[PDB]
């Protein structure tokens, strides 16, 4: 009934370590805060995990404005007019357009403005 | 190209370190006067580990002069765990940190 | 049923309701178990040492903290306590029971008394070539009262007796034979 756990623990650590890129001076191999720093980073990522998709909701937000206004108006106008829509409703891709295909964008831009006034 | 060395070398790894960090990657003969007429200890030593170096080559690793030190380094190891005044109660030992001494000697 | 008689070309004996029956794994092992059990050994770690020396666990209000365990080689913590009651007396009924149904498993092989006579471990190389295979692999000696002489020695020893030859016995996977007097243990059954 010997338990020389050995070889085992050591491993684990390696484990984490890996989890251990080459982050900040130390932890680097910090078989502790090593481990730690982790936990941290983690959860972080997480919250980041759901985060992003937001950072986007906005990103487009501007690149959007960049145009929405360009022509001559804001995203409480557009929007309103847009939803006046009926067989066509989208936002994301819209942007990355106005920039990709000017005409395209430019377009709706109209059909829009209108829908509105 | 060939190389010189020697462990169980009593001395300030560190100090040593400056040693080369000079004559470092440079013409043989050349630095061969750096350490000849530089200062701080090690030198002496340092010099030495350049002669059995220049030697070894030409002799068994072969084109003289055209040579130099593509690279040079030193490492510490074996200590000398040394005992001193018992905290006037508990022991306080230092360590004459042994000293390795490798160093390249390749031909131009 | 298919109570095959040895000597092969000779007769055939009946299957005794007993063996017949179904099966009872649970008990199965169990029988087992209550085997190794009453049959292992024991051990532990020093009583003297592991609580052997004096000890000056040190005052305190100094820079420390404190003849017991938790600083090296010494102590234990709850080790081999030889005083480790090892037995496990299954239970009569229990036991017997096992072997039974047990054997039952065996059935799934008839040793003519007449054999209780053959006199050389090369007469086994014989009554061998009689009926070999892999199950023989198993094998499993056993006469009926007083073992199958020489029959006892070879590269598969083991000579129970129409009395004394249980699961521990062959029960394991295994495959064997019993001299009538053997099925004299059945009576034991």
């Amino acid at each position: 009934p010997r338990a020389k756990t050995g070889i085992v623990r050591r491993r684990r650590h390696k484990k984490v370590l890996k989890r251990a890129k080459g982050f900040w001076g130390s932890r680097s191999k910090q078989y502790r805060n090593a481990f730690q720093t982790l936990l941290n980073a983690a959860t972080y990522e997480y919250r980041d995990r759901r985060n992003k998709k937001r950072d986007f909701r906005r990103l487009w937000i501007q690149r959007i404005n960049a145009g929405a206004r360009l022509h001559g108006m804001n995203y409480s106008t557009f929007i309103n007019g847009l939803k006046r829509a009926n067989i066509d409703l989208n936002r994301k891709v819209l942007a990355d357009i106005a920039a990709r295909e000017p005409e395209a964008f430019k377009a709706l831009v109209d059909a829009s403005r209108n829908a509105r006034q | 190209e060939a190389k010189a060395i020697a462990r169980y070398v009593r001395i300030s790894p560190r100090k040593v370190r400056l040693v080369v960090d000079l004559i470092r990657g440079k013409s043989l003969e050349e630095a061969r006067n750096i350490l000849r007429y530089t200062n701080k200890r090690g030198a002496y030593f340092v010099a030495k580990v350049l002669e059995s170096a220049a030697a070894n080559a030409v002799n068994n690793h072969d084109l003289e002069d055209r040579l130099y030190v593509k690279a040079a380094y030193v490492d510490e190891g074996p200590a000398l765990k040394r005992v001193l005044p018992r905290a006037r109660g508990r022991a306080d030992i230092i360590k004459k940190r042994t000293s390795h001494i490798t160093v390249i000697l390749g031909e131009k | 049923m298919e109570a095959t008689i040895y000597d092969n070309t000779d007769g055939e004996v009946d299957l005794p309701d007993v063996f017949e029956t179904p099966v009872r794994s649970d008990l199965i092992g169990k029988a087992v178990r209550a085997a190794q059990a009453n049959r292992k050994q024991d051990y532990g770690s020093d009583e003297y040492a592991g609580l052997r020396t004096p000890a000056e666990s040190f005052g305190s209000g100094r820079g420390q903290a404190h003849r017991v365990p938790q600083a090296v080689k010494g102590r234990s913590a709850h080790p081999p306590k030889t005083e480790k009651d090892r037995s496990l007396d299954l239970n009569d009924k229990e036991r017997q029971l096992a072997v039974r149904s047990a054997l039952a498993a065996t059935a799934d092989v008839v040793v003519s008394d007449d054999f209780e006579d053959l006199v050389k471990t090369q007469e086994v190389v014989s009554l061998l070539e009689a009926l070999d295979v892999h199950a023989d692999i198993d094998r499993l000696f056993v006469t009926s009262d007083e073992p199958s002489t020489a029959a006892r020695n070879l590269a598969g020893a083991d000579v129970a007796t129409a009395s004394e030859v249980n699961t521990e016995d062959l029960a394991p996977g295994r495959l064997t034979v019993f001299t009538e007097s053997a099925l004299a243990e059945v009576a034991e059954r």
């Binding site: 959860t43 067989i87 989208n90 005409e103 | - | -």
Partner: protein, 100 residues
Amino acid sequence: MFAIIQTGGKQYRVSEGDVIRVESLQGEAGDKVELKALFVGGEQTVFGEDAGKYTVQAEVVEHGRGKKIYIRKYKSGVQYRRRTGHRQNFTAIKILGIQG
């Protein structure tokens, strides 16, 4: 060759470059299959029209493969004595943009 319809989720702006697509384990199985995908973003060869003008025709793409979670780890942790770990999910079966 560049259209932008929208599936059980926009996931759009394509034409031919098969676009890793959200699950759909009922029509999919259809290996290199064909199926309709309502439009609403008619952008082809510098000519556009309502995504409501569209909502009439559309396209279709061949049920290509079944991407297997493109790695992605989720260290679920906090100082608050709560840890745990689960790897990516979101796959998906791939399929080219059959345009028309």
